[PDB]
Inverse folding.
């Protein structure tokens, strides 16, 4: 299951990115990551094609935000299982209860 | 229920943004978010039209603050339910006890 | 009860701001807030006129600090009750035991 | 057992770095480290030659990321045991359960 | 009892500031404060004249540090009791056990 | 017992600094400190002459790191006991179990 | 009015059955679960007075049928004073709210 | 003077009834709830001496009527020494203050 | 439907045997372990109703064979109400999910 | 010398009365309160040996008068070894220090 | 196969002796220690089945010789299901791994 | 060799006396204090075997003289396996180290 990420500078924009992503295709927002310098990432999981659709929409929508800025984005089609155990890209408890 | 966000650089300004928002219309301040680089966001919930009124007032009032600066703002009319589970835009425990 | 805020860049200056505020008038320092980028805020509560007196003194005294810098300030005469529940402007446990 | 590190500015890029590293050779991603200013490090362990292979791939892949930036990298062939006890380069609980 | 503060950019320098302060006069280092942007403060308590001696020595010694930088300093002769309850300038548990 | 400190900008470099320090002479790495703005410090303890040897090696090795940068360094020959109680320069639990 | 209903059991299995029988028998929300020792645990439900009475009755009959089941005490409070919400686990949690 | 009133029960339901009966019978504030094992739990109220006496009496009569209810001990302290506030859960909390 | 199965024992060793026998005897997942005092502990499993019945039966037979083993109570809930998931440790955890 | 005095009760109300009677009967400071199960709780006071003896005696007489009161054990240590301070809740806390 | 061995005692001293006797009598690793109330505590060891049997036997003989020693229950599981690792303290910890 | 000595009491006051008598009677360090329920608590000391024997003996005689004192179990382990240090509170803490 692919992973999609949009990193913005600013919180409002990251929230819009996430909203646009889950609305554009069949992906689950699994988390959000702060790393400082105003950089925040929203992470979604789903089929590669769903994730591609969601990230493209997420980027477009975030850039429309008043003062919105997208810093980086990336999609990994088949993330190695090891990552699930170290980085915050896994379906969380709260998350799978929403499903 | 819509979500409204004002991100400022500086705490005093974000506090004013929040005060102005809840006073301008029928919205509930549900939280506050720090992301570093002096960037803080206040988040309100309510009817889209209430939120529109509150954000416009929040922006005007924050800009009047001595040294106040607004970095970004955004309103999402119908935030996807998935967001409530990942991002800090949900009515909190403390919050719904105030209601 | 009004809320007064002085945000400085630097800790020594914020400590002086707070000392000057509680000494200048009848206000209670209720808290302190860090938001990154060296930005820290001290928050006091009291009658609007007391708070006005305290913030003016706090600003003057903070600017006298060696390397002191004031970034922003603001006073809200009647902060909405909703804020008390979300933002760190409320009388705390430790605080009301000092009173 | 060698330690390999790639530090990026941006989260998406660090996630790609990690994915590329564990896919390129026989290394275990043991952790991730945030230090502010958007600087994040992913850490892998394995035979020196595996780690060399993984870091080279991790760097190439991270630089291909949209808005990806690599700040620093380093490999230590035989890290002193003392480090395992202070710095986050050790196999963690969650990690060795994945193995 | 007076409070003395030296804020540096850099940790090594703040550690030297503290060492120099407690060695120069009869003051107790009561704490250390991080506020981001590399800004850290060391706080001492003691008689105003002891604190004056310690801060002057602390500044001189910190500036001798390789890459040492002092950002701000301040002394408050009779800090208001209210501050003890909000800001980290109080004798701590660990601290008074050293005494 | 002397204290030695190397502060870098970047995590990989600080890890190398630490490795080089404990390998160059008879010192114990006792901790690591993050203060933001990418500034991290590694702290060692040992005889002044051991610490001098370790810091010199730590600096040389950190500067060889790809993208490595050393911001500041310092050695305190006889750190005042008060510091042990406030600043993170003390032998920790985990640490003395390694010994 | 919105009553609170409580069933206390000796043993966890029996208390889980009480809870399941309570929310199934009537229009009530399980809001809490309280451990106090001696194998005594309480499930707390909220709802209309008549709904809570229906559910507590169902809860008790079912719990007593559990193998090694044992009900210690029960009680229904019709109009719980607001003060209680703030001290005891009878209040709704945002957790059980989202649901 | 401002007395403290305590009812200790065996069982949680009975202690919740004690609390509800206490704050309802007189001008007192429930400030705490204390678990100590063996199924023993205490509700603590604050108020004038005469108010606390009225409420403790109501509390006990009501608690004994709870199904499987059982009161273990009670006590009213008329002028609790200030020292106690700082060690025991008899003090008001900002939680119960806001209310 | 997806039932929940619970075995409560007196003693930890016996409860660990119950759990091991349960997941081995049928298609069930151990999702929780609950301590409530008096030496009473519960293991909770999730699975189809028929699978959970098979496993609880195996669990009980095995637990009673443990040296100093002792089963206090057991229960199977066929269709646990969703409300319970949110209050009690019967829900899957991302921990047991990854597995 | 500075002795430590302890009264252990069965029940919380009685232990709160012990504490109140102790600090009122003599020049002692309540520094701790210890829960260990089976409804056993201890109040610990510090002071001169003769002061602690006066207070423990008062404490016991008063505690035994509490409704459902019960004193389990008491003890006075005249010169408690410094080692104990560091392991047990007999030491002053900055909490009780500020007072 | 890698079995798990458990000795549960009444009393801590006896459980510490059990653990010491177990790891000394055979090739096993103490991985956990479990408190569940009523003075019942368990030590858990991991190792080959034959090694764990040797150690549990040694553990029990030694524990029964402890003054006021008392063994409540014991059990050896030869092939503990992987599910258990994720719910119970039978798994290795990085703590006991480093050793 | 460096033995561990343990005295377990019923009641806290008696356990505090045991500890005080132990460190006073011989060259031992109190390193821990363990609560396990049923009013059972253990004090743990470290030292030479002969020193620990002297202290445990003193500890027991003194504890039995405590009003309402009661010793449940004791034990001395001459050469505690290193594995134990990592699982149980018999290890020195940096807390008791600094002293």
């Amino acid at each position: 299951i692919a992973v999609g990420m949009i990193e913005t500078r600013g919180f409002p924009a990251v929230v819009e990115a996430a909203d646009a992503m889950v609305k554009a295709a069949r992906v689950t927002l699994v988390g959000y990551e702060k790393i400082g310098s105003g950089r925040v990432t929203v992470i979604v999981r789903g089929d590669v094609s769903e994730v591609q659709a969601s990230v493209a929409a997420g980027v477009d929508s975030a850039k429309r935000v008043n003062g919105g800025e997208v810093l980086s984005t990336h999609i990994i089609a088949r993330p190695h299982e090891n990552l699930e155990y170290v980085l915050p890209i896994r379906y969380t408890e709260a998350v799978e209860q929403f499903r």
